[PDB]
Amino acid sequence: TAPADSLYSRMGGEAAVEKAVDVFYERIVADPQLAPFFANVDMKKQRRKQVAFMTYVFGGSGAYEGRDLGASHRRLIREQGMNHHHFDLVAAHLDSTLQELGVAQELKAEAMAIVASARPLIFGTGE
Numbered sequence: 001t002a003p004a005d006s007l008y009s010r011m012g013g014e015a016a017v018e019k020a021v022d023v024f025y026e027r028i029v030a031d032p033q034l035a036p037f038f039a040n041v042d043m044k045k046q047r048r049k050q051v052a053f054m055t056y057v058f059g060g061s062g063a064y065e066g067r068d069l070g071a072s073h074r075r076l077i078r079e080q081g082m083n084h085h086h087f088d089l090v091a092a093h094l095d096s097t098l099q100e101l102g103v104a105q106e107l108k109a110e111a112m113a114i115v116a117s118a119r120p121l122i123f124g125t126g127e
């Protein structure tokens, strides 16, 4: 059974969440300011990352399937210059995706709040 705060049903079901994350991911990698970070990413990793997006953003309490977010981006930040601007771009691509799909405002806002919760997990909480 799905958790109480699972957004899958309201998004139209798992297939619909999977399609929305596809559109979103396509936006990310088509972004000239993000594409360079994704050039090295092979297909197995891409698929794991999409599953992480699906479950982290829409899966609800206890549903997250994937690597720790801190560890996943630590090298990107230390060695390749990943920064808060890239996060802003990625958050905005999800917003655009949901808006373009016509997602109701309340549902869209819950999803965007969940995306925002990833920021301190990736960049730490502050010095």
Ligand code: HEM
Pocket: 034, 037, 038, 040, 041, 045, 048, 049, 052, 053, 056, 066, 067, 068, 069, 072, 073, 076, 082, 086, 087, 088, 090, 091, 115, 118
């Ligand atoms: C809610 C936000 C995010 C989530 C849930 C997330 C999730 C993940 C996960 C779980 C991985 C590891 C995949 C694996 O190998 O199993 C990953 C890797 C990666 N992420 Fe994210 N991420 C987020 C934000 C971002 C942002 C803002 C960027 C912008 C650059 C980004 C770029 C990447 C890249 C380029 C990789 C592959 C790194 C490598 O080659 O190992 N992610 N992400």
